[PDB]
């Protein structure tokens, strides 16, 4: 009872949201190099036997709609759920191409009371995004 | 007979709260480069938190920014693993 059951018929979905180009209103830069990440993640999760879905350049409304829709799928035959977010961010926030959305809005769709076919199963969110604007200068070892 | 609605989530953040996260225009982001390398090497052997700890070490030790702007030069990053998991996770 100490390890999650990972021998359901399917490992589960791996949704990759890859935001590279942002509207001028956001004041955000283009994220050169993110397609390398998106391709690397798709291959990595394919080798782990996840059903990978890559989505590119989603608005904040599209992000919320995609996550709502995924949370309404029947995951009963899936062991787990993975979501990877590649975008700009600040603390608690990820950017759609047209502006910010609270990470809690995304993850709430998957709470144990709201996505019953994932209750008891691991829900992994991998977040490549800034969390603010502090720099770590490091210390010599 | 109940579990918490927030249980069984893991948030693998690329950087600590409050910090920038670094991305290389040729190689991809430091965190995702490291995460994919460690999953490729260790997903058939190690538990996920231990894989993520190796990702933390790889990002912290092998990367340092290079910038023509001194303000952004020679900077470092540590990822941040946030686990509300209740069991060990092995991908096999």
């Amino acid at each position: 009872d100490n390890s999650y059951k990972m021998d359901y018929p399917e490992m589960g979905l791996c949704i990759i949201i890859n935001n590279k180009n942002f509207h001028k209103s956001t004041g955000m830069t283009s994220r050169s190099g993110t397609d390398v990440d998106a391709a690397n993640l798709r291959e990595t999760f394919r080798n782990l036997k996840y059903e990978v879905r890559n989505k590119n350049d989603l608005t904040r409304e599209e992000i919320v709609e995609l996550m709502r829709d995924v949370s309404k799928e029947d995951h009963s035959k899936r062991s787990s759920f993975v979501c990877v977010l590649l975008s700009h961010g600040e603390e608690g926030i990820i950017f759609g191409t047209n502006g910010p959305v609270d990470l809690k809005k995304i993850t709430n769709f998957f709470r144990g009371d709201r996505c019953r076919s994932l209750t008891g199963k691991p829900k992994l969110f991998i977040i490549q995004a800034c969390r603010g604007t502090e720099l770590d200068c490091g210390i010599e070892t | 007979h109940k579990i918490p609605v927030e249980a069984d989530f893991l948030y693998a953040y690329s950087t600590a709260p409050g910090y920038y996260s670094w991305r290389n225009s040729k190689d991809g982001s430091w965190f995702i480069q490291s995460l994919c390398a460690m999953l490729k090497q260790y997903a058939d052997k190690l538990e996920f938190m231990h894989i993520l700890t190796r990702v933390n070490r790889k990002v912290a030790t092998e990367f340092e920014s290079f910038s023509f702007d001194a303000t952004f030069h020679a900077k470092k990053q540590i990822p941040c693993i946030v686990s509300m998991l209740t069991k060990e996770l092995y991908f096999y």
């Binding site: 994220r31 | 690329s14 920038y20 670094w22 991305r23 290389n24 225009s25 982001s29 910038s67």
Partner: peptide, 4 residues
């Protein structure tokens, strides 16, 4: 190297 760039920031997000």
């Amino acid at each position: 190297d760039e920031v997000x």
